[PDB]
């Protein structure tokens, strides 16, 4: 199960990032992300920004309702419980669920650019970057410690392979 993001910075195509989802370990979390990528439910990631990009840490996005971390929702209604914490944040290039504490998974996600073991048991890891990591790096280079970006970076288009 692979999905992708066509990323743009200020309307300029930067490249396509492809993720492999861990359907076998976290099927419910993977399905949520997959559906949001295709937009088949009537809402999703296309057009949503990477509102928080922090160099030496991670890229966060997925808030398609407010684009600032206060919005977003899962395909299950509101927020859903943490499926499990089997997968760990042992290296860069991992897809994990951003949240507001225990069992508050919605649509926001983050892509690690460094190992983040201290997040184990706190955030549900559900995928990895299999193509376009160089694009993740280009996006990271446009971030700042506060997470703010000078360019408007968005998931211009998304879908499943």
């Amino acid at each position: 199960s692979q999905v992708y993001f066509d990323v743009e910075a200020d309307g300029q195509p930067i490249g396509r990032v492809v993720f492999k989802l861990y359907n076998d370990i976290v099927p419910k979390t993977a399905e949520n992300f997959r559906a949001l990528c295709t937009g088949e439910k009537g809402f999703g990631y296309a057009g949503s920004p990477f509102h928080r990009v922090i160099p030496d840490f991670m890229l966060q996005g997925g808030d398609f309702t407010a684009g600032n971390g206060t919005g977003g929702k899962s395909i299950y209604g509101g927020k859903f419980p943490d499926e499990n914490f089997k997968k760990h944040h042992d290296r860069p290039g991992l897809l994990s669920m951003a949240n507001a504490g225990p069992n508050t998974n919605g649509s926001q996600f983050f892509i690690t650019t460094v190992p983040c073991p201290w997040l184990d048991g706190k955030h549900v890891v559900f995928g990895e970057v299999v193509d376009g990591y160089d694009i993740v790096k280009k996006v990271e280079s446009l971030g700042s410690p506060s997470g703010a970006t000078k360019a408007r970076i968005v998931v211009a288009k998304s879908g499943e392979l």
Binding site: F57, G69, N99, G101
Partner: peptide, 5 residues
């Protein structure tokens, strides 16, 4: 707002 960062 998590992960902090």
């Amino acid at each position: 707002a998590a992960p902090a960062x």
